Amino acid sequence: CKRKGSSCRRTSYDCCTGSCRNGKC
């Protein structure tokens, strides 16, 4: 999964923590 502070896609649930907002976690 993605880390908070990394980049993740809008609503693809990519992160383990952090909102995927503005193409970032």
Q: Output the 3-class SS for the chain.
A: CECECECCCCCCCCECCCCCECCEC
Cα(7)–Cα(21) distance, rounded to whole angstroms? 9
What's phi and psi for 17, nearest 5 deg? -155, 145
Residue type, 3: R
Cα(1)–Cα(20) distance, rounded to whole angstroms? 12
Cα(15)–Cα(8) distance, rounded to whole angstroms? 7
Short-list 19, 17, 21, 15, CA closest to 2: 15
**Determination technique for this entry:** NMR
The number of domains in the chain is 1
Residue type, 21: R
Handedness of CA 16, 6, 1, 9 (dihedral sign): positive
What the block records as the tokens of 24 is 């970032």
Residue corresponding to tokens 């193409």? 23
Cα(21)–Cα(25) distance, rounded to whole angstroms? 6
Task: Show the domain range for 19.
Answer: 1-25
